[PDB]
Amino acid sequence: QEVTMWGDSHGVAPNQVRRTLVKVALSESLPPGAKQIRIGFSLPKETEEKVTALYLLVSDSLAVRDLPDYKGRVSYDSFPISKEDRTTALSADSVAGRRFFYLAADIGPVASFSRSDTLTARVEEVAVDGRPLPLKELSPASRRLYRGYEALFVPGDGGSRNYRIPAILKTANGTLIAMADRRKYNQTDLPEDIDIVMRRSTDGGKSWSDPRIIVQGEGRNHGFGDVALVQTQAGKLLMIFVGGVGLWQSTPDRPQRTYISESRDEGLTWSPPRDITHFIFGKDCADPGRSRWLASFCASGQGLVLPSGRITFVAAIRESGQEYVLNNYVLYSDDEGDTWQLSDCAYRRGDEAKLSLMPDGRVLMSIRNQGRQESRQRFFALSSDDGLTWERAKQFEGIHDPGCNGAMLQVKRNGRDQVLHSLPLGPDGRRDGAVYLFDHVSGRWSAPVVVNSGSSAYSDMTLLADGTIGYFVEEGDEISLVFIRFVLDDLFD
Ligand SMILES: CC(=O)N[C@H]1[C@H]([C@H](O)[C@H](O)CO)OC(C(=O)O)=C[C@@H]1O
Numbered sequence: 484q485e486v487t488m489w490g491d492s493h494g495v496a497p498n499q500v501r502r503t504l505v506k507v508a509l510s511e512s513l514p515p516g517a518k519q520i521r522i523g524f525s526l527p528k529e530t531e532e533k534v535t536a537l538y539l540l541v542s543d544s545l546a547v548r549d550l551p552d553y554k555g556r557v558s559y560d561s562f563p564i565s566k567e568d569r570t571t572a573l574s575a576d577s578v579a580g581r582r583f584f585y586l587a588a589d590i591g592p593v594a595s596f597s598r599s600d601t602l603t604a605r606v607e608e609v610a611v612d613g614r615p616l617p618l619k620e621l622s623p624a625s626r627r628l629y630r631g632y633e634a635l636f637v638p639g640d641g642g643s644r645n646y647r648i649p650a651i652l653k654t655a656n657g658t659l660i661a662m663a664d665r666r667k668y669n670q671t672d673l674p675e676d677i678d679i680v681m682r683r684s685t686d687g688g689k690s691w692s693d694p695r696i697i698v699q700g701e702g703r704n705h706g707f708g709d710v711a712l713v714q715t716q717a718g719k720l721l722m723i724f725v726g727g728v729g730l731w732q733s734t735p736d737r738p739q740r741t742y743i744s745e746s747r748d749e750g751l752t753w754s755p756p757r758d759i760t761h762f763i764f765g766k767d768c769a770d771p772g773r774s775r776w777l778a779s780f781c782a783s784g785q786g787l788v789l790p791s792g793r794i795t796f797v798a799a800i801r802e803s804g805q806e807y808v809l810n811n812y813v814l815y816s817d818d819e820g821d822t823w824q825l826s827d828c829a830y831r832r833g834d835e836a837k838l839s840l841m842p843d844g845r846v847l848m849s850i851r852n853q854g855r856q857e858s859r860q861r862f863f864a865l866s867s868d869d870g871l872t873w874e875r876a877k878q879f880e881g882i883h884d885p886g887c888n889g890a891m892l893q894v895k896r897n898g899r900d901q902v903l904h905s906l907p908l909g910p911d912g913r914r915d916g917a918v919y920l921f922d923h924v925s926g927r928w929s930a931p932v933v934v935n936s937g938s939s940a941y942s943d944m945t946l947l948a949d950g951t952i953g954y955f956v957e958e959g960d961e962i963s964l965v966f967i968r969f970v971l972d973d974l975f976d
Pocket residue numbers: 648672673709725729730780834835853
């Protein structure tokens with residue numbers, strides 16, 4: 484006869500409805516001799532001012548996210564509470580044998596969006612006919628306000644059990660393209676059966692089209708995923724992705740293949756996928772020095788189109804069956820994706836790597852630290868010839884990498900050229916999604932700022948037209964893909 488309690492720590496945005504603050508779970512249904520349950524809670528005046536209404540929600544599901552994020556797959560009743568009240572009661576009959584209770588709120592309109600712009604509440608008492616039950620707290624509540632915050636892909640959406648691997652792209656016309664692994668049966672990588680799914684926004688991420696499967700996987704060893712995105716200088720959209728067996732199961736004669744698809748109408752329609760594995764490695768490769776290589780995949784998220792028009796993604800390539808490590812090469816095209824070539828080797832024992840354009844026209848590459856090498860720090864390299872040749876740049880190091888994909892944006896802050904990098908803070912785990920700012924002139928990283936506390940993994944970022952940052956992250960143990968919008972001052976002033 485015990486209650487367990489979880490405070491909620493997901494972000495919120497103005498005017499959102501029925502946002503959970505804390506939820507509690509009874510160990511058992513109320514007994515037949517129970518007439519009413521009554522829950523007492525604490526809620527600071529600072530939180531009270533930022534909400535317009537409270538509610539007690541009752542459900543037969545114990546959910547991770549806000550109940551409306553499940554688009555009806557969670558069933559609940561909702562009972563309002565005056566914001567000034569600190570207790571509420573409900574009849575056993577109305578609970579109808581259910582065990583999961585949520586204290587939720589409607590978020591007001593005003594906001595300052597600073598680091599201290601947070602919301603919290605705590606359940607202090609759950610009494611059944613005046614008998615307090617033992618209460619155990621597993622997590623506190625702290626919900627930060629952002630300019631935008633929306634779960635774009637939630638486990639269960641459209642009948643897929645899971646979602647992973649976010650990719651985000653803003654077009655020259657302002658269209659937002661969001662893509663992801665639709666991980667149908669569970670959260671594991673290829674060779675599992677996986678689709679590529681998409682949603683679009685034409686209003687800067689205020690609203691999003693219904694999700695559309697654009698590449699359908701056809702069974703185990705026949706799925707697709709790990710999408711990266713660019714817009715070419717001629718204006719076409721380009722996705723690149725892998726499909727087939729797993730990374731370490733690929734071979735020269737039976738590869739996990741690399742594909743590209745293009746769109747000429749802002750992501751509405753896409754060309755039938757085109758196998759470009761033969762430009763890279765394996766049995767159909769024209770370069771005999773790469774015909775015995777085993778595997779290649781481009782880092783999911785975004786590529787980079789250079790000022791010349793050269794299209795680039797970083798591939799991480801397995802050259803030997805005698806080792807489980809990868810080497811980085813830039814995959815590029817100077818003819819709008821018609822043909823593809825590889826740079827010289829950019830990193831030895833690398834992994835998922837990302838590119839960004841330096842103020843002086845050099846290319847900066849950020850390299851995932853796979854295998855807890857060295858000091859468990861993120862790796863960096865530099866190229867001065869548009870990605871053809873590379874050199875390690877230790878002076879950019881200085882942030883921890885638990886072994887996870889992330890992203891870079893070149894931005895101006897207070898007149899000064901800086902790199903914004905997204906990565907889990909950890910330590911040594913995929914936890915607390917954070918961003919850092921690297922100052923070009925001083926060569927020092929900022930202290931991290933945690934955007935989403937809790938389990939956090941892959942992230943992609945884009946610069947919106949008005950300077951806001953779109954931040955697309957893997958939140959939680961069973962992952963939802965979440966689009967968050969903030970400006971730099973919200974995080975760093
Ligand atoms: C094609 C592929 O396998 N991509 C996977 C990537 C890769 O396995 C690793 O980067 C190599 O070390 O890892 C992860 C991961 O969450 O860690 C997710 C990707 O789906």
